[PDB]
Amino acid sequence: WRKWNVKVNHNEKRYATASAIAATAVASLVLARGHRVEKIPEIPLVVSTDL
């Protein structure tokens, strides 16, 4: 009966994922994180719906 899971306010959860999405633009972050995007066409990288 140790606490295993953790409550996080839903809205704070969203703030976080919103921030996280915003950062998937911003090449230097993507670079800093590992990730070999030093020669992708552009960022955000968007691709055909055909995928």
Binding site: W1, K3, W4, N5, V6, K7
Partner: protein, 203 residues
């Protein structure tokens, strides 16, 4: 029919005809064994309103049980503990004398199933009961959509578990504010109200 007559007559236990009857019968029983087969209900109107039927695979046993308090056993009255528990002698027992009645004939006829039971008499030493029983492997019973429930295993020794009418009574099984303690059955609801319920996401 005559059963309505028998019913009303039976409520006049102070009446001259009935105390003659009470007095002769109660001597006769006391002469017989403490548990004995009864040939036929002696209150046929009572038996049949508790589920009895004059077909084969229905049985009546008459049984006798001592009256009075449960004297707490214990050598010489010694309790070995706190004062609140030093009683020995005004101690009363939570089951009815009729439960004892049932349970003893029930052990005497383990091939049978106790269906129900009723009071017939008493003196100062004993209460006397007739117990009505059903044979769950009699084909007469095993057929019979009305009684073959009693054939399921869930109903073994109902008398030993508090499931006859006497037992549900003493167990306190009744709806309402007066039965909060004892109703979903008391050990179980205690356990309920003393369980710590923790959620993954603590409430």
């Amino acid at each position: 029919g005559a059963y309505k007559y028998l019913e009303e007559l039976q409520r006049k236990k102070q009446s001259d005809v009935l105390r003659f009857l009470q007095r002769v019968r109660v001597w006769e029983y006391r002469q017989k064994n403490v548990i004995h087969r009864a040939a036929r209900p002696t209150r046929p109107d009572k038996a049949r309103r508790l589920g009895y039927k004059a077909k084969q695979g229905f049985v009546i046993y008459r049984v006798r049980v001592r009256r009075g308090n449960r004297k707490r056993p214990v050598p010489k009255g010694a309790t070995y503990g706190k004062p609140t528990n030093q009683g020995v002698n005004e101690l009363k027992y939570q089951r009815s004398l009729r439960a004892t009645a049932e349970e003893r004939v029930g052990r005497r006829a383990a091939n049978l199933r106790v269906l129900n039971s009723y009071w017939v008499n008493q003196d100062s030493t004993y209460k006397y009961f007739e117990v009505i029983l059903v044979d769950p492997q009699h084909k007469a019973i095993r057929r019979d959509a009305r009684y073959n429930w009693i054939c399921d295993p869930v109903h073994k020794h109902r008398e030993a578990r508090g499931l006859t009418a006497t037992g549900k009574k003493s167990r306190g099984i009744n709806k309402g504010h007066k039965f909060n303690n004892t109703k979903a059955g008391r050990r179980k609801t205690w356990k309920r109200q003393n369980t710590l319920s923790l959620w993954r996401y603590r409430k």
